[PDB]
Write a protein that binds this ligand. Structure first.
Ligand SMILES: CC1(C)[C@@H](O[C@H]2O[C@H](C(=O)O)[C@@H](O)[C@H](O)[C@H]2O)CC[C@]2(C)[C@H]3C(=O)C=C4[C@@H]5C[C@@](C)(C(=O)O)CC[C@]5(C)CC[C@@]4(C)[C@]3(C)CC[C@@H]12
Lengths: 583, 582
């Protein structure tokens, strides 16, 4: 259902705070959800659990963990319907109401919930256990594989993506209420015809006893259009368009109305009116060419891992404005909903991406014993959930289906083909892409024609023609010539950068130095400006972030333009110089 | 009123989130709370606003700021009373409901609230504006003075303390409900007769029609004792005590009961049965001698300033447990209430401290034109609000009235005298202290005898000009001798350490190196261990933190044993060695 909010007809209780916490063990205490959890450990809830406790065993845990607390259902919610929702459980979440299992959810970055109305009475207290598993298989969405170390028998988790596999309840948890007759979902699609905006709306409600009313109210509070019935099309004369650096949001009020025109339910949905179209080599927002600038990001901060953080979000956006970035990509999984809402308000453009990284074992990637049909089912599901949650965001401008898949290999085409079709059928208003890895050159890639925009990740400077920028430059523009020659589509570089340690400086060409980072980005830009077909540049990455451990990762990925704590490297100042002065 | 909770009779709504934010300005919008703020800025609400926006004007701003958002009172609060509460607005907060002022509060680190029951009806939406001011004066409890830079006209805030003057709503904001008859306060006081535990309670409730019941439930869910009446003494045979090693917490449920046997209001107060006592030079918890190990801390993290953060809190306590630290002090303001609850559960011991730092201009500090009796009122007020909120925490084992006052100057004894009497009077169950500065030597100080425990801050700087260890050692020992000859009280060292940059190393004796910090702590310990009267050692500081700009401050205070982002310097390992053993 829709993201809960408080209305005149709905109440909303945060369940954030400290919960009791335990790992699964191998004792008789199988089934921790059947009684009061016995632990001194408390884990804060919007957070990944891994780095919270300064304990290796928790950090390295493979398998299930348990969060628990008591909840009291407000006494005045008899006569109403009520749910427990996890905005996200990374990767597999189970909800229990006193020992009854009431939801079982497999994706790691989208919402799930359970209607507990008939299990617990208003004003009753219950024990809420939420079990979350972190295990990845070749069928989970980021896929991976658990192994056992021979000598010690320690379980270990392998996977093919960079960022660390933080787990837990990294986003907030809620108790909320709706009326018996309630709104469940709303879809809004926005076109523009001259100066007139139009909203195609569709409301889905638990009942059609009593009817649906809509009002559309502008930023000044004046009702600018009205409509009746669950589905319809509204015109808005002289619209204020939502624009890439000037957000404008109307506010769509969907209500359920009884025989007496008495409101029995209501929901307020923020709406930006704007259009995305791809025309040849151009990416058009409101019929005008747009050029992405900004980053691929990560949900990653010092202690709470991937947990949502209001402050770092608002700061992160301020830093985007400060350097004149107009966009980012939700690199390698959907971010928290609040980020998308905030982007809507900040006038920031978003490439919104599924959790589908790691579909590459370079052993044939797309085969029965690796990334097969059952993985595609999970991928299809990821696509549906992402789209079902983020479809109404004006800031969301395109769907990214995957990141660095092995789109050069046999089987890749048979695997991906249905997916861009599924997306476009779920949401026909946005174009679809994926992020292409170096191995799938314009010659070798077998999947690119099935997409509306091409996104490329490239590290010519760093990984291959190492510190040889003149060699990287030639190879970069060879590759881009190939792509422009072969496809009539917009090109966005979604990765390009260099690991860089704050304070490490050199007047020579030296990788891992701030000078090198600047020089490489600056070369890439020179090359970008040589190609009419370029529609965007998003540096990798906004900020240093944590990775699986490895002799080649210096306490994480240090390709950030800011440090993990958001201090700017020289690179940051270079981008600021370029993005505040370019078109 | 008591820290609000959700019960069967009470509802609690978090108002944290992003709020509209504006700086005050000198335009005809002289009153932003009378209408929707159309600013595009949004500030997150458990946070200080200063480093959040990446904006100078906002960071350096002196004066009021406005937070704003709409709220809806739930439909079902009809028969109910409801309030808006700020846990804290630093330093001066105002709450507005649609153009109307309904609360005005002055301290920066304790809660305030307003009964809005009669202004807004159940199911109504209203505009909530909260004004927060950051100006310090000579009468604000951390005192200060606003000044004008002559060449630029720029407004600037002076003060005498280290930590940066972060402001805003650094703590959570709430809408909550309470029945017409409700409990408003509870005092518990715990003591021991043999193996039987004693709980004196007093419950203050809005009306006396229909009685009060108390149940005391143990960690297994067993009701272990009951009582009737608004106040009384409950006996807990074979009590499990709250100990520094090992928290045990009973759960006391105070209720109001109607004519029938029907619960009208209820409230769940965690209580740990424990005594604190000073005897000669010994600090006793449950009759056995106690030695404080741990830190002076601060509420300081990278972006959110002093904003409370559950993650950093849990981690910071794991690091304490990791290095075997058993205590910390709330230098230099009461910390979030949730930290004190968490301290109760973690078995960690707390010296709880007021905002009264910076009462020192080293011109005469204690005089009619400086820190005066009007200031003393704010100070008394600060003691009152702190003790009222933290009185029931078993973790809180001592009140610290001030940090680094000029306790050596004329006027200082006459200013301070009322204050420890006031504290002991509002809480007779704990001892009172203050953290003494290096100027106020055993000779010079004229306040110390008025307190129950002596806490010394003795950075080596007080003792040596050129970072010479043997020089520092001789002077620290001389001074500690003075204190132990002249007072029969426990001594706790509450500040010692060295500015230290992570990664700066030297095989020599070099200040600002990880080695120097190690050697200095270690030398201090050797000196402390020579003195029986020592009851404690808390290093300054737990972690690196932000300060006002000073060419002597390297983007803040680097005396942390951890970095701002909680990485250990060598000193952390050295402390871990000492505290995990003896
Ligand atoms: C690592 C990935 C998957 C790709 O994404 C990465 O982004 C960031 C990073 O690189 O640091 C991090 O977020 C994280 O590490 C990853 O998600 C970046 C590109 C990537 C490293 C590829 C290459 O850079 C180049 C490769 C070449 C291709 C080719 C044709 C050649 O240049 O000659 C063959 C040799 C080689 C090394 C084969 C591997 C890839 C395709 C490589 C290393 C794969 C992984 C990519």
């Amino acid at each position: 259902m829709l993201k809960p909010q408080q209305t005149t007809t709905r109440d909303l209780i945060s369940l954030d705070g400290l919960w009791k916490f335990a790992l699964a063990s191998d004792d008789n205490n199988t089934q921790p959800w059947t009684s009061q959890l016995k632990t001194s450990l408390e884990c804060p809830v919007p957070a990944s659990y891994n780095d919270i406790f300064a304990d290796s065993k928790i950090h390295d845990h493979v398998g299930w963990v348990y969060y628990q607390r008591d909840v009291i259902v407000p006494k005045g919610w008899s006569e109403e319907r009520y749910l427990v929702r996890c905005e996200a459980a990374t990767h597999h979440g189970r909800i229990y109401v006193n020992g009854n299992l009431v939801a079982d959810h497999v994706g790691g970055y989208t919402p799930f919930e359970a209607d507990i109305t008939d299990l617990v009475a208003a004003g009753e207290q219950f024990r809420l256990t939420i079990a979350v598993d972190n295990e990845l298989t070749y069928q989970t969405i980021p896929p991976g594989k658990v192994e056992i170390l021979e000598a010690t028998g320690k379980k270990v988790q392998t996977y093919q993506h960079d960022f660390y596999n933080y787990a837990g309840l990294a986003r907030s948890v809620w108790l909320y209420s709706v009326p018996q007759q309630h709104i469940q979902d709303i879809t809004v699609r926005t076109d523009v015809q001259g100066t007139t905006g139009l909203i195609d709306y569709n409301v889905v409600a638990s009942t059609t006893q009593g009817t649906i009313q809509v009002a559309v109210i502008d930023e000044d509070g004046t009702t600018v259009a009205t409509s009746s019935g669950s589905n319809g099309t509204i015109h808005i004369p002289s619209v204020h368009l939502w624009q890439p650096g000037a957000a404008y949001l109307y506010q769509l009020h969907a209500s359920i109305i009884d025989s007496s025109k008495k409101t029995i339910d209501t929901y307020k949905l923020a709406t930006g009116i704007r259009t995305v179209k791809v025309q040849g080599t151009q990416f058009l927002i409101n019929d005008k060419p747009f050029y992405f600038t900004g980053f691929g990001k990560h949900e990653d901060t010092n202690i709470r891992g991937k947990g949502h953080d209001d402050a770092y979000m608002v700061h992160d956006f301020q830093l985007l404005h400060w350097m004149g970035a107009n966009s980012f990509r939700t690199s390698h999984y959907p971010y928290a909903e609040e980020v998308m809402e905030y982007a809507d308000r900040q006038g920031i453009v978003v490439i919104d991406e599924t959790p589908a990284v790691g579909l590459a074992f370079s052993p044939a990637t797309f085969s029965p014993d690796r990334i097969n049909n059952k993985t595609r089912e999970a991928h299809a599901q990821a696509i549906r959930e992402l789209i079902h949650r983020d479809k109404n965001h004006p800031s969301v401008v395109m769907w990214s289906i995957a990141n660095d898949p092995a789109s050069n290999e046999d089987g890749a085409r048979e695997y991906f083909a249905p997916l861009p079709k599924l997306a476009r059928q779920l949401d026909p208003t946005r174009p679809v892409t994926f992020a292409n890895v170096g191995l799938a050159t314009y010659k070798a890639d077998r999947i690119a024609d099935l997409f509306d925009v091409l996104c490329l990740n490239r590290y010519f400077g760093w990984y291959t023609q190492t510190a040889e920028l003149d060699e990287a430059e030639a190879a970069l523009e060879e590759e881009l010539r190939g792509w422009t020659e072969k496809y009539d589509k917009p090109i966005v570089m979604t990765d390009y950068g260099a690991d860089t340690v704050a304070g490490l400086h050199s007047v020579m060409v030296t990788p891992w130095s701030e000078e090198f980072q600047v020089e490489m980005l600056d070369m890439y830009h020179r090359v970008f400006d040589r190609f009419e077909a370029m529609a965007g540049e998003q540096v990798w990455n906004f900020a240093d972030f944590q990775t699986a451990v490895g002799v080649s990762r210096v306490d994480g990925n240090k390709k950030g333009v800011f440090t993990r704590d958001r201090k700017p490297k020289a690179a940051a100042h270079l981008l600021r110089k370029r993005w505040t002065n370019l078109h």
